[PDB]
Amino acid sequence: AWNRVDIAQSELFRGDIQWRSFHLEASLMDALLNDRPEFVRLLISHGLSL
Amino acid sequence: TTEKPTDAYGDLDFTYSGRKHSNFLRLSDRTDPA
């Protein structure tokens, strides 16, 4: 929502948190309704199935 | 043990995903690695 990749990439995907699937899918829907191409690329890159 | 020639040699790949097809073979133990 803040449109700041440099926080989310560097603090939430270091590997400390084992993220489940629907935790990513809800955020991807928030990233598709708003206009953030960088977060869409970042969330598909973590092994999600459409 | 009743030994028989196999059937499972695979052009295996994964459903609803982007991975390239994976080559695949079921193999018995005590076989020759050559």
Count other C-beta atoms under 10 Å from residue A39's C-beta: 20
Instruction: Decide: A39 and A5 in contact? Cβ < 8 Å.
Output: yes
Instruction: Decide: B22 and B9 in contact? Cβ < 8 Å.
Output: no
**CA separation for the pair A25, A21 (Å, rounded):** 6
Q: Is A50 on the interface with B (CB under 8 A)?
A: yes
> What resolution (Å)?
3.2
Distances (CA, A) of A1 to A8, A27, A30: 11, 9, 8
Chain B, residues 1-34, CB within 8 A of chain A, namely 16-17
Distances (CA, A) of B27 to A20, B3, B19: 34, 12, 23
> What are the binding residues of A for ATP?
20, 47
Distances (CA, A) of A6 to A36, B3, B9, B23, B28: 13, 58, 46, 38, 50
Chain A, residues 8-27, CB within 8 A of chain B, namely none
Instruction: Decide: A49 and B17 in contact? Cβ < 8 Å.
Output: yes
